[PDB]
Amino acid sequence: GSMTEYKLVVVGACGVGKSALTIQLIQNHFVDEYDPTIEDSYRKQVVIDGETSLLDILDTAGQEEYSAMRDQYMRTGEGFLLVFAINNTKSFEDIHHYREQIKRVKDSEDVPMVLVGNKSDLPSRTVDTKQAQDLARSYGIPFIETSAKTRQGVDDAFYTLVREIRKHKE
Ligand SMILES: *CCC(=O)N1CCN2Cc3cc(C#C)c(-c4c(O)cccc4Cl)c(F)c3OC[C@H]2C1
Ligand SMILES: Nc1nc2c(ncn2[C@@H]2O[C@H](COP(=O)(O)OP(=O)(O)O)[C@@H](O)[C@H]2O)c(=O)[nH]1
Ligand SMILES: [Mg+2]
C-alpha cells in the first residue's frame, strides 16, 4: 500500500558509532570491528506513527570528502544524523564543521537534522547531556542519546529524523 521513502545520511568523526548505529537498526547486531573505510547504504521498511516508511541510510566512512559519489548522496539526502560519542570531546566540537558543510552542499538553512550522542552506555563520559542540549537548541534540532551496544534510543534517533523531514515538507 501507501509508503514514503526517506534518504538518510549518517555523519560524524571516526570511531563514534556511525556503522554500529546503522547495523543495530537494520539487523539487531552490535558490530565490534566494521572496516572504517567501508561506505555502504542499508534499506529497512518500518511503521513510524502508523505510516509505512522505507529508510535508505548511507553510513559515511574514510573516503575522499569531495568525490562525485559523496556529493550525489549529500545532494539527494533528505535528513542527516549528526553523531558524536559522549566520551569524545573532539567529535562533539566537530559537529559545528559538519552542520555548516551539510548546509553548504544543500545550499539551504533548513536541512532536517538530529543531534545524536552515541555510546551512552559508557561511564567515561566527557560531554554532559546539558552541553549537547545547548548545542542542539543553538541549531534548533532535537538531541537523542543512543547506544549501539544496548539499543537505547537507536530507533528513536532515526524515527525522530523521519518526523523532522515530515515537518520540513509542510
Ligand atoms: C574513521 C573514518 C570515517 O568514518 N570518516 C572519515 C572522516 N569523515 C569526516 C567527514 C567530513 C566531511 C567534510 C568536509 C563530510 C562531509 C562531506 O565530505 C561533504 C559534505 C558534507 C559533509 Cl558533513 C563528511 F560527511 C564526513 O563524514 C564523517 C567522517 C567519516
Ligand atoms: N560501548 C559502545 N561502543 C560502541 C558504540 N557504538 C560503537 N561502538 C564501538 O566503537 C567502535 C567504532 O564504531 P564504528 O561504528 O565503526 O564507528 P564509525 O567509525 O563512526 O563507523 C567499534 O568498536 C564499536 O563497537 C556504543 O554505543 N557503545
Ligand atoms: Mg564506519
Author numbering: -1 to 168
Task: Pull text from the paper.
The switch-II pocket is a shallow pocket between the effector protein-engaging switch-II loop of KRAS (residues A59–Y64), the α2-helix (S65–T74), and the α3-helix (N86–K104). Upon ligand binding, this pocket undergoes significant conformational rearrangement [e.g., increasing in size from 150 to 280 Å3 in the case of sotorasib (3)].
We describe the construction of a cross-docking database comprising 100 examples generated from 10 structurally diverse KRASG12C inhibitors with known X-ray crystal structures (3 of which are newly solved for this data set) and describe a method of incorporating receptor flexibility into CovDock to produce a docking protocol we refer to as FlexCovDock. To further benchmark the performance of FlexCovDock, we collected ten co-crystal structures of structurally diverse ligands demonstrating conformationally diverse switch-II pocket poses. The adjacent α2-helix (Ser65–Thr74) likewise demonstrates significant conformational shifts across this set of X-ray structures. Ligand–receptor interactions can differ substantially between different copies of the same binding site within a single crystallographic unit cell.
